[PDB]
């Protein structure tokens, strides 16, 4: 299964606006959601410091998605599902994928009980979902901030199993390769790049730079 | 809840100087680039041009280079255009607009007519 | 330098017809296109956020369509609101381009 090629997708994560949380009072949800909304924008600012040849293709990808309009067509396209095929301006077909959605739960759940009720919380189920929600993140920015916002191998955090199938069950390939590459999915993992692209109207995006084996 | 409100009607005289501002309430103003769009009384709307929210470079619609100029306040969260030498020809509504997630997002227009 | 046109420059319709307008790009926008509706004196308001997905807030009666180079949005009934001017603007690259506008007006 001899690597000959690369195939660039593109990761997205939906991200939120944290406005400043105008209310007083110190209770202890209250306090351990402010100390993981704290975290999360922490996330958001180091990746956004770690922003501003085997991943040649995925730079070139990376300088393409920064210009103007490319988020916004990515956007539109992942709208309604979580998984499209965008062609940039370039001529290339992208394959991008939306593996997670914070800004709906951040907005819909935390906003009201933060803003409304001048932040009174009262179950504790809300602040282990958070945290819980909020992990991920936390680690796709830890280990892009040790490894200088290129990682490889592609980490679980990165992309999941499920989410790596379902990548290899829709590049152009042949069947034989499909099911070659979803019978070695940790041999695919040991190959392949994330590389970090951009944080650009309100969303988080990395290229992860699979493998294609043309000679089976 | 994502407002652009812009600036008041003006009336000046060919040869003068303009300047419309653009204010930008209801997101983080320095993640998307604020777009301008310029329409015209009977022709078609005309898009002409753009400026980055964070180092401020502008960049021009081929129809608009030359003495339109866009400059912002980052602190301020505001935008706003400069239509040096007006003529009878730049008269119109000018637009101020931003990436929504496929379309536009318009603000009200200011109608800067050229009369003498 | 993608140039789009609408083909009914006007129109005309009763309080219960369903329409079509259409516009033809000159080039290959795969699917990014949208279309503004322009009341008595306000600013383009849109309707959908791309060819087919219609955008939240509006009524279900719009239904867009199309890939490519040929695009069509249809109003299923007409309303004394469903009155203005629809252009349709590409998103694909710039410069952005508008189609020449539709005008339409009662029966």
């Known amino acids: 299964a001899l690597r000959t090629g690369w195939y660039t997708s593109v990761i997205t994560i939906e991200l939120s606006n944290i406005k400043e949380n105008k209310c007083n009072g110190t209770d202890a949800k209250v306090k351990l959601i402010k100390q993981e909304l704290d975290k999360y924008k922490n996330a958001v600012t180091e990746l956004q410091l770690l922003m501003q040849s085997a991943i040649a293709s995925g730079v070139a990808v990376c300088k393409v998605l920064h210009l103007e309009g490319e988020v916004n067509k990515i956007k539109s396209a992942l709208l309604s599902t979580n998984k499209a095929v965008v062609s940039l301006s370039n001529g290339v077909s992208v394959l991008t994928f939306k593996v997670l959605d914070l800004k709906n739960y951040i907005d819909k759940q935390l906003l009201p009980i933060l803003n409304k009720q001048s932040c009174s919380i009262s179950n504790i189920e809300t602040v282990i979902e958070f945290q819980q929600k909020n992990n991920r993140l936390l680690e796709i920015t830890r280990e892009f901030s040790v490894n200088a916002g290129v990682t490889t191998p592609v980490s679980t955090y990165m992309l999941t199993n499920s989410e790596l199938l379902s990548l290899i069950n829709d590049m152009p390939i042949t069947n034989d390769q499909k099911k070659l590459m979803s019978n070695n999915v940790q041999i695919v993992r040991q190959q392949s790049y994330s590389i970090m692209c951009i944080i650009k109207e309100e969303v988080l995006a990395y290229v992860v730079q699979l493998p294609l084996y043309g000679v089976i | 809840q994502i407002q652009l409100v812009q600036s008041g009607p003006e009336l000046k005289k060919p040869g003068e100087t303009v300047k419309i501002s653009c204010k930008a309430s209801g997101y983080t103003f320095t993640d998307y680039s604020m777009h301008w769009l310029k329409q015209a009384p009977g022709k078609g709307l005309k898009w002409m041009g753009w400026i980055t929210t964070e180092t401020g470079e502008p960049t021009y619609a081929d129809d608009f280079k030359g003495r339109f100029a866009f400059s912002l306040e980052t602190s301020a969260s505001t935008a706003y255009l400069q239509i040096n030498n007006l003529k009878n020809e730049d008269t119109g509504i000018y637009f101020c607009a931003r990436y929504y997630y496929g379309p536009f997002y318009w603000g009200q227009g200011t109608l800067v007519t050229v009369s003498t | 330098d993608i140039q789009m046109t609408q083909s009914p420059a006007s129109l005309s319709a009763s309080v219960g017809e369903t329409v079509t307008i259409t516009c033809r790009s000159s080039?290959?926008?795969?699917?990014?296109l949208t279309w503004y509706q322009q009341k008595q004196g306000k600013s383009p308001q849109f309707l959908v956020y791309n060819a087919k997905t219609l955008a939240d807030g509006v009524s279900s009666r719009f239904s867009g369509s199309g890939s490519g180079t040929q695009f069509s949005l249809k109003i299923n009934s007409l309303q004394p609101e469903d009155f203005g001017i629809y252009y349709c603007q590409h998103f694909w690259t710039t410069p952005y381009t508008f189609g020449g506008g539709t005008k339409l007006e009662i029966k």
């Open positions: 080039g290959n926008i795969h699917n990014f």
